[PDB]
Design a binder for this molecule. Structure first.
Ligand SMILES: CCCCCCCCCCCCCCCCCC(=O)OC[C@H](COP(=O)([O-])OCC(O)COP(=O)([O-])OC[C@@H](COC(=O)CCCCCCCCCCCCCCCCC)OC(=O)CCCCCCCCCCCCCCCCC)OC(=O)CCCCCCCCCCCCCCCCC
Ligand SMILES: CCCCCCCCCCCCCCCCCC(=O)OC[C@H](COP(=O)([O-])OCC[N+](C)(C)C)OC(=O)CCCCCCCCCCCCCCCCC
Ligand SMILES: CCCCCCCCCCCCCCCCCC(=O)OC[C@H](COP(=O)([O-])OCC[N+](C)(C)C)OC(=O)CCCCCCCCCCCCCCCCC
Ligand SMILES: CCCCCCCCCCCCCCCCCC(=O)OC[C@H](COP(=O)([O-])OCC[N+](C)(C)C)OC(=O)CCCCCCCCCCCCCCCCC
Ligand SMILES: CCCCCCCCCCCCCCCCCC(=O)OC[C@H](COP(=O)([O-])OCC[N+](C)(C)C)OC(=O)CCCCCCCCCCCCCCCCC
Ligand SMILES: CCCCCCCCCCCCCCCCCC(=O)OC[C@H](COP(=O)(O)OCCN)OC(=O)CCCCCCCCCCCCCCCCC
Ligand SMILES: CCCCCCCCCCCCCCCCCC(=O)OC[C@H](COP(=O)(O)OCCN)OC(=O)CCCCCCCCCCCCCCCCC
Ligand SMILES: CCCCCCCCCCCCCCCCCC(=O)OC[C@H](COP(=O)(O)OCCN)OC(=O)CCCCCCCCCCCCCCCCC
Ligand SMILES: CCCCCCCCCCCCCCCCCC(=O)OC[C@H](COP(=O)(O)OCCN)OC(=O)CCCCCCCCCCCCCCCCC
Ligand SMILES: CCCCCCCCCCCCCCCCCC(=O)OC[C@H](COP(=O)(O)OCCN)OC(=O)CCCCCCCCCCCCCCCCC
Lengths: 80, 110, 105, 57, 175, 347, 98, 48, 70, 311
């Protein structure tokens, strides 16, 4: 499992490089901390119009102006 | 519109250069020549290996046709599913390549 | 033999591509989102036999939204009458259909 | 309501035209040059327009 | 004249199949199908289907019709044709193709305008630019959704392509 | 063929039929038919002889034409309905195209002209698959689109299929072509009762698959492909002699055997709907099938016996062949008629 | 119905009539079959782009890929025929008359 | 380097999209008045 | 010696420099001294046709500023 | 005004292809310890003009063609696809600015094998047909890794736009995160155009005259210059100031000349592959590494949160 690895690195380095790159491409998106930021950036990219809501009277988490405190903020994206 | 004009101008320049290349030395009255290669009168034998590499091109080209919208699919919200299906398509292209390997399909044009 | 595995197990294998009114990427509407939504909500759950004769108005509105055969028929009628009146010399086109009016926005 | 939009947009631009028409003109000319109209090519004119707007308005 | 252009291409498209459904040869059949693929791709591209037209070129024409011409050229043993000096070897080609465009322009006659003008599409047919879409081709994002939404579709398609490789390698063995 | 590759290809055939059976979408119907054809093409070429390549070529041409006509019917449905649910079709042009395409995939007449050829070109197990498993997917689509199927067209195809599958069985000594014309006649029987009671369609399908599988399993157990080669069964394995022929007496449609179970039930659903002439004509043609197949029964259980001397050597060796489910399928293809009201499980 | 759809259907039926009257070769049959597939691609594409139905835009590519794989299968069948007789003639494919 | 620059380009894409979002009410009101102008003109010329 | 290849390389380099310089100067000539408007998307084309309508002379590249509002 | 722009693209392409023959013969001269042409013009600057006037009045071979139409449509298609590959190339702004210029170029280069195939069948020779089938198999083989490498690189771009590819590389060259893709791309473009050491046609279109051979020749060299410019834009993308586009134009011109002379310097250095050895190079060396790097450049912007913008 180690002498076989040295043998296949001696005979066929192309397939060893291919299986190593493919194995890292499989495992490393889960072992990474920055993978969640890909999800967050792709879900915070505004392709549509943010259709507003009628104010029924009791919605504390929804702002009234873009320059309000509450609302989803992208301080993490500006700073990183 | 500009693309169609550009294609038409490229086609016109191509046909003009072909027409000049055929009609300009046919001004010459050089000689009418007679008496018409590694085979003289042999038929063509078919080769199975050339057809195998043509169909291998076609099947991997279909797999590439599936792989083509990946720079657009990177922008989606369901990145775990998108990554799984992208890796699954490239893995199936690799499994098709390994099956082409081990059944001696890539031999004498390896 | 319609073995509805997708309703037994609770998987969505091909329901998402089926109708236009389903969840589209980036919330893109179809051209006939309202008409197909009304034909589906009309004809839901009552079966095909009742759905043919009891939702024909919504279905014909949706078919005419798809093919636009009545709208193309109406535009051909109006354009034919307009061409006949321009040919007879009994009508003149307005400036806002001839191209001398410096469009709105 | 749409006309209300077209009532409030003009009063947006008039309030730029009374106070800060020249940094705004220098800014939208550099916006107007680019083919894709990049914000990333016009940062000093953006800083001048934002500075003059935060001051005068 | 320029308005009816998709319709014009469609007419040429129909005529293109009469190039090879009459079947003069498999090689000229492939040539007529390539020309028909190009003009049907022009029909696709003139509705804003840019990616699908480039799939016609890249996968149908440059991917598959290459293989059809390749397999045809490994069969149907060839023979020479007329090879006199330039009054035959290119002059007959130019007169024949001018008669082909004469046939293309020749069908737009009084039996055509009774269908064209009574059922005028151009003016109200091509409606792909009906309003705004945004910062994205809707057709591009619909093809992009093959990976997030089309999980089962990609599974059965990749399985069919793997089985296609296996099936071709089993039937083309002879043993 | 590599046995792992054989298992993968057979599971792909089953997967294509299952994708046609479970899908609510037309593209997946088309994908399942494409997968089914693509995977069944090496099953026909298991032996690599020119008759299998000819059979696979004819099968590819017919099934590909049927697949393209199916996709044109789907496209015309998307015109006149804007949707993709596998339900009734919203244009009788698309209905006629899908009915013609499914009749081509089943090999119903007048699109029957590939069924006795291809079944002749291929081995007995691949012919078994072609005449049992490949019926299941187009009959499932016909089960799911019957509010749009034209009555006159499906009855025309049904009675033409029964007449041509009847008069095909005269001039044949090949067992595989006789099973193919029996296939054509039984598909006419199945699509006769489709717009009246599709439970009897599924009953006829299950009884047909059981009888066809019993017959092909007996043909594989004896390795006989012609009538004249079947005629030596009495001297080699005498228990094999009658089971073929009581199963074929079932396949004609003859009481008290269970092959009388479909046709009678079909008549039992067509005299309800005031059609008296049409089941009368179809079952007179079934008696014509009895005529030719009873002549084959006389050929094997009686007159044309005589043996050759090398048969004496076959007496010193039993069948080591897998006769898989052959007693079960032989019991289920004859003695099922006293359990005829089991058909309610097929609703 | 509509006009350009009628043209694409006319091409489909013309390549069908070429696919139903064989002259000499099997390659002519495969070419008419793939002209049918091409017309199916064109007509599906114009419907899907017309209605702005977004998720079906992957459908013609699917309709391409499978069917192109189908064509590959057909080409391989032709090759095996041309390895037995030397030509791809459909009249060499008549041994299953008996 | 591609990490930092693709992240910055995503921030620029969000800035351009917010410019679009801030302009969409005016463009939608002008689009509404555009189509109603043209349909009223088509109605009056249809009536004459 | 080795610098003898440089006239041909220079001629080929001028022949490659001419198309890009040419299309940049034509884009600045036909668009009011500026770049050509890139409309890859429907929003860019919508703003572009809005410019063509607000300019009044059927030309998108005539920019109307604050002088066109009161 | 647009036709002026089309002519100022297509005439300097033909002049650059004409003088590429001079640059090739001079650089291959000095690398082979000899001189290249210097007698005809001053330092050889009239050798392309003399060669062109020689080839365009040379006798046609009176070809025994198996077809008229494919014999005429193979040089026509070769020149048309040689010219139309240039129209989306951003220099820094292309002739046809299209959203899918990369995919357009991949499609129009995948269509370029029909000139080879129609030249092969339009000859009566079975040996020329066998050579044409081998060339077609080689070219469609290497188009696979063209497509996969090109896709893997454009996973860092955001879209198939060639002008966006200039915006992508404003901070770093794209050869730094993608040099294995760069070197396999470069050998793959070397093997597309049947360029040495992949030139087994000199180891199919000899049925033609010398004039139509000059047409196939100049289409091949236009493809060489075009793929060098496309590789320059794709991996060594230059700095661009929108107020002075000539900086980008001179910069990618110098890089394109260096990469074309790198083709000229590869062809004067190596022996040819045997045919199965370059099929081994594609199907058993470049294709596993290329698929692994395709998986890598899919999954890498997801794990590094470096997913490029769509627009
Ligand atoms: C439910 C529907 C099920 C339908 C049938 C499923 C099986 C058929 C397909 C697979 C197959 O070929 O299996 C072989 C098949 C036998 O068929 P065969 O090869 O033709 O038999 C030849 C000899 O019997 C072989 O003899 P042997 O010398 O090899 O050794 C004895 C052998 C050894 O077997 C064992 O050892 C089995 C026990 C171990 C199982 C594995 C454990 C791990 O025992 C048997 O095989 C005895 C016969 C078993 C009965 C076969 C038919 C079953 C009933 C089918 C449905 C009938 C419906 C009638 C309805 C009528 C009214 C409508 O089955 C088995 O071997 C296992 C039977 C399991 C029965 C389970 C019943 C309940 C299911 C719920
Ligand atoms: C831009 C790229 C390059 C473009 C092409 C090059 C530019 C110049 C093109 C024209 C070159 C001159 C004409 C072709 C060469 C003729 C050579 C030749 O053998 O001529 C004798 C031929 C025939 O001469 P002959 O009558 O002695 O015939 C010789 C053959 N025997 C004796 C057996 C019968 O002359 C011609 O055919 C006349 C051609 C035109 C002459 C010039 C007219 C004006 C042209 C402007
Ligand atoms: C072998 C198959 C490997 C891949 C299996 C599916 C992986 C996956 O992404 O599943 C989640 C996906 C989708 O889940 P999801 O996480 O994308 O859900 C989010 C909701 N949508 C899709 C609307 C954005 O699939 C399923 O949940 C069901 C489909 C797969 C069912 C199993 C197929 C097996 C085929 C064997 C032959
Ligand atoms: C002669 C033997 C066959 C006759 C079978 C008829 C049995 C029956 O129910 O007849 C009523 C049916 C009539 O069906 P019906 O009852 O629906 O008739 C119309 C309804 N009334 C009577 C109220 C107006 O008779 C037939 O269909 C006669 C034709 C039988 C089929 C053709 C036989 C050809 C020769 C063999
Ligand atoms: C874009 C601008 C240009 C880019 C650069 C290109 C310019 C330089 C050109 C030089 C001249 C080329 C002449 C022709 C070349 C043709 C022959 C040739 O070289 O064939 C290719 C050769 C072929 O090798 P071969 O032919 O010797 O192999 C023999 C094979 N067997 C034994 C089976 C017979 O090499 C390759 O295929 C390698 C390609 C590049 C690989 C890059 C890998 C990067 C590293 C990955 C990770 C590895 C470690 C493992 C994981 C570690 C993790 C930490
Ligand atoms: C799980 C991650 C994703 C994996 C899938 C994606 C992979 C991308 C690359 C696809 C490659 C497709 C083709 C692979 C075929 C493998 C079989 C093979 O090549 O066997 C033959 C070979 C012996 O060489 P030979 O036969 O002589 O070659 C002819 C020329 N001389 O035999 C060999 O050379 C041995 C080759 C197999 C063993 C290689 C081991 C590499 C290990 C690298 C480190 C660990 C990586 C982690 C994953 C484990 C991978 C095994
Ligand atoms: C032996 C039979 C083993 C059956 C195992 C269970 C399979 C199952 O769940 O079947 C469900 C099916 C009833 O499902 P249903 O919704 O009625 O089907 C619609 C038909 N178009 O149930 C049935 O159809 C039961 C009868 C199946 C008989 C199959 C063999 C003949
Ligand atoms: C509502 C109902 C829904 C549907 C219900 C279920 C429908 C089932 C339809 C079954 C169709 C089966 C077709 C045949 C099996 C498929 C695989 C196959 O062919 O296996 C046979 C196998 C091949 O072995 P091989 O080595 O190739 O033999 C040839 C000589 N060398 O081995 C042999 O050749 C050995 C010989 C015996 C093979 C017997 C196979 C019988 C299988 C069918 C059983 C009966 C049907 C199922 C039960 C009733 C339900 C209808
Ligand atoms: C973007 C860059 C593109 C660059 C392309 C051009 C590259 C080459 C640049 C110029 C190189 C030198 C050209 C002159 C070569 C020598 C010609 C000459 O003088 O030949 C002498 C010959 C004999 O005449 P005779 O009078 O008898 O001499 C005895 C002395 N009394 O008399 C004659 O031969 C007669 C006179 C002929 C003169 C021909 C000169 C060359 C023509 C080139 C045309 C194309 C130029 C570029 C066009 C596009 C740009 C404007
Ligand atoms: C043997 C015959 C002769 C052989 C030599 C000549 C033919 C072969 C060589 C030339 C090939 C022609 C290719 C034509 C289409 C190329 C693809 C294409 O149009 O892509 C560009 C573009 C898509 O990009 P995108 O930015 O999305 O579009 C603008 C959106 N804002 O889309 C557009 O810009 C769309 C522009 C309008 C549509 C153009 C339609 C062209 C005419 C129809 C096809 C003509 C060729 C037919 C025969 C082909 C034979 C191979």
């Amino acid at each position: 499992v180690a002498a076989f690895l040295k043998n296949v690195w001696a005979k066929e380095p192309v397939l060893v490089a291919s299986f190593a790159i493919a194995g890292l491409a499989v495992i490393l998106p889960t072992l990474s901390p920055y993978t969640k930021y890909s999800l967050m950036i792709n879900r915070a990219t505004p392709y549509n119009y943010p259709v507003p809501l009628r104010d029924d009277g009791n919605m504390p988490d929804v702002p009234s102006h873009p320059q309000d405190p509450q609302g989803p903020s992208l301080e993490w994206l500006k700073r990183l | 519109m500009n693309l169609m004009i550009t294609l038409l101008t490229n086609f016109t320049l191509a046909t003009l250069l072909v027409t000049i290349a055929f009609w300009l030395p046919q001004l010459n009255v050089y000689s009418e020549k007679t008496s018409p290669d590694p085979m003289g009168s042999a038929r063509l034998p078919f080769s199975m290996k050339f057809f195998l590499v043509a169909i291998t091109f076609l099947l991997f080209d279909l797999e590439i046709a599936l792989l083509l919208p990946l720079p657009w699919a990177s922008q989606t919200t369901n990145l775990n599913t998108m990554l799984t299906m992208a890796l699954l398509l490239i893995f199936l292209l690799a499994v098709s390549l390994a099956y082409e390997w081990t059944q001696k399909g890539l031999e004498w044009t390896e | 033999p319609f073995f509805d595995v997708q309703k037994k197990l609770g998987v969505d294998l091909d329901h998402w591509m089926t109708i236009q009114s389903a969840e589209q990427p980036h919330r893109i509407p179809a051209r006939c989102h309202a008409f197909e939504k009304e034909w589906i909500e009309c004809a839901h759950g009552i079966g095909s036999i009742r759905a043919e004769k009891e939702c024909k108005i919504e279905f014909e509105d949706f078919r005419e939204c798809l093919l636009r055969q009545k709208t193309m028929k109406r535009l051909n009628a109006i354009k034919r009458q307009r061409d006949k009146l321009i040919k007879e010399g009994k009508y003149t086109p307005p400036p806002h259909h001839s191209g001398q009016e410096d469009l709105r926005p | 309501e749409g006309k209300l939009v077209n009532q409030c947009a003009l009063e947006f631009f008039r309030q730029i035209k009374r106070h800060c028409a020249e940094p705004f003109t220098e800014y939208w000319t550099c916006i107007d040059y680019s083919g894709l109209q990049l914000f990333r090519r016009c940062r000093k004119e953006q800083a001048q327009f934002d500075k003059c707007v935060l001051d005068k308005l | 004249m320029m308005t009816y252009i998709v319709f014009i291409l469609s007419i040429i498209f129909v005529m293109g199949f009469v190039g090879f459904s009459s079947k003069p040869s498999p090689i000229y059949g492939g040539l007529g199908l390539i020309v028909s693929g190009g003009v049907g791709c022009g029909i696709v591209l003139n509705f804003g289907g840019s990616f699908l037209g480039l799939m016609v070129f890249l996968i149908y024409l440059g991917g598959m019709m290459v293989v059809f011409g390749y397999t045809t050229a490994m069969a149907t043993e060839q023979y020479p044709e007329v090879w006199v000096s330039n009054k035959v070897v290119l002059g007959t080609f130019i007169t024949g193709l001018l008669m082909e465009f004469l046939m293309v322009y020749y069908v737009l006659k009084d039996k055509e305008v009774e269908i064209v003008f009574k059922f005028n599409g151009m003016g109200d047919w091509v409606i792909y630019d009906t309003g705004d879409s945004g910062f994205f081709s809707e057709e591009a994002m619909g093809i992009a959704a093959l990976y997030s939404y089309g999980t089962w579709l990609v599974i059965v398609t990749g399985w069919s392509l793997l089985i296609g490789v296996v099936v071709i390698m089993e039937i083309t063995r002879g043993n | 063929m590599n046995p792992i590759i054989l298992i993968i290809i057979l599971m792909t055939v089953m997967l294509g039929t299952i994708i046609v059976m479970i899908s609510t979408h037309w593209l997946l119907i088309w994908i399942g038919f494409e997968m089914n054809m693509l995977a069944i093409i090496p099953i026909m070429m298991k032996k690599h002889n020119p008759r299998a390549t000819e059979a696979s070529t004819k099968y590819f041409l017919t099934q590909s034409t049927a697949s393209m006509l199916l996709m044109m019917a789907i496209i015309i449905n998307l015109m006149f309905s804007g949707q993709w649910t596998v339900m009734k079709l919203f244009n009788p042009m698309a209905s006629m195209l899908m009915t013609m395409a499914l009749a081509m995939k089943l090999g119903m007449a007048p699109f029957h002209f590939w069924v006795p050829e291809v079944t002749q070109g291929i081995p007995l197990s691949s012919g078994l698959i072609l005449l049992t498993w490949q019926k299941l997917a187009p009959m499932s689509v016909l089960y799911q689109i019957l509010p749009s199927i034209n009555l006159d067209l499906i009855l025309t195809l049904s009675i033409l299929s029964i007449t041509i599958g009847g008069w095909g069985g005269l001039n044949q000594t090949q067992l595989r072509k006789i099973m193919a014309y029996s296939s054509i006649a039984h598909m006419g029987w199945m699509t006769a009762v489709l717009l009246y009671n599709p439970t009897m369609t599924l009953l006829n399908l299950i009884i047909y698959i059981i009888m066809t599988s019993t017959m092909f399993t007996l043909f594989m157990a004896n390795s006989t492909t012609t009538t004249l080669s079947l005629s030596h069964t009495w001297n080699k394995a005498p228990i094999m002699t009658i089971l073929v022929l009581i199963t074929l007496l079932s396949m004609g449609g003859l009481p008290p055997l269970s092959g009388f179970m479909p046709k009678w039930m079909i008549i039992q659903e067509m005299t309800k709907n005031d059609s008296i002439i049409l089941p009368t004509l179809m079952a007179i043609t079934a008696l014509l099938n009895l005529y030719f197949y009873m002549r084959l029964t006389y050929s094997t259980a009686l007159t044309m016996f005589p043996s050759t001397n090398n048969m004496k050597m076959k007496w010193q060796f039993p069948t080591t062949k897998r006769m898989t489910l052959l007693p079960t399928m032989t019991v289920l293809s004859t003695m099922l008629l006293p359990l005829t009201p089991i058909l309610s499980i097929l609703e | 119905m509509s006009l350009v759809y009628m043209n694409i259907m006319m091409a489909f039926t013309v390549s069908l009539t070429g696919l139903l009257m064989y002259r000499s070769h099997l390659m002519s049959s495969l070419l008419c079959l793939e002209g049918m597939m091409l017309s199916l691609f064109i007509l599906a594409t114009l419907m899907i782009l017309n209605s702005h139905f977004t998720l079906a835009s992957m459908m013609p590519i699917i309709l391409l890929v499978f069917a192109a794989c189908e064509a590959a299968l057909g080409l391989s069948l032709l090759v095996m025929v041309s390895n037995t007789y030397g030509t791809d003639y459909v009249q060499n494919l008549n041994l299953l008359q008996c | 380097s591609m990490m930092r620059w693709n992240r910055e380009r995503r921030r620029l894409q969000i800035e351009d999209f917010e410019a679009r979002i801030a302009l969409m009410p005016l463009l939608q009101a002008e689009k509404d008045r555009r189509v109603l102008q043209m349909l009223r003109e088509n109605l009056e010329e249809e009536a004459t | 010696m080795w610098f003898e290849v440089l006239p041909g390389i220079a001629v080929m380099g001028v022949c490659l420099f001419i198309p890009g310089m040419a299309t940049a100067r034509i884009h600045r000539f036909s668009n009011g001294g500026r770049e050509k408007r890139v409309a890859h998307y429907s929003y860019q084309w919508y703003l572009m046709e809005r410019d063509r309508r607000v300019s009044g002379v059927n030309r998108y590249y005539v920019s109307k500023g604050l002088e066109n509002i009161d | 005004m647009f036709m002026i722009n089309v002519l100022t693209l297509i005439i300097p392409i033909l002049l650059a292809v004409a003088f590429l023959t001079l640059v090739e013969r001079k650089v291959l001269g000095y690398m082979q310890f000899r001189k290249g042409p210097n007698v005809v013009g001053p330092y050889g600057l009239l050798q392309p003009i003399a060669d062109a006037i020689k080839l365009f009045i040379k006798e046609p071979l009176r070809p025994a063609t198996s077809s008229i139409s494919m014999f005429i449509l193979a040089p026509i298609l070769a020149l048309t696809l040689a010219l139309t590959m240039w129209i989306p190339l951003p220099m820094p702004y292309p002739l046809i600015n299209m959203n899918l210029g990369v995919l357009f170029m991949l499609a129009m280069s995948s269509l370029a094998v029909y000139s080879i195939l129609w030249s092969g069948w339009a000859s009566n020779s079975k040996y020329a047909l066998i050579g044409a089938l081998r060339a077609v198999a080689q070219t469609i083989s290497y188009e696979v890794t063209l497509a996969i490498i090109l896709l893997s690189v454009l996973l860092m771009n955001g879209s198939f736009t060639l002008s966006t590819l200039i915006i992508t590389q404003e901070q770093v060259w794209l050869i730094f995160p993608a040099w294995p893709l760069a070197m396999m791309w470069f050998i793959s473009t070397l093997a597309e155009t049947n360029r040495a050491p992949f030139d087994l046609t000199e180891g199919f279109n000899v049925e033609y005259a010398a004039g139509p051979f000059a047409l196939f020749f100049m289409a091949e060299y236009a493809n060489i210059i075009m793929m060098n410019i496309f590789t320059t834009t794709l991996f060594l993308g230059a700095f661009h100031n929108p107020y002075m586009p000539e900086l980008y134009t001179i910069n990618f011109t110098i890089k394109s000349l260096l990469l074309s002379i790198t083709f000229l310097w590869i062809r004067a250095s190596y022996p040819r592959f045997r045919y199965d050895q370059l099929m081994h190079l594609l199907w058993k060396n470049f294709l596993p590494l290329t698929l692994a790097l395709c998986m890598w450049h899919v999954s890498l912007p997801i794990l590094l949160s470096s997913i490029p913008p769509q627009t």
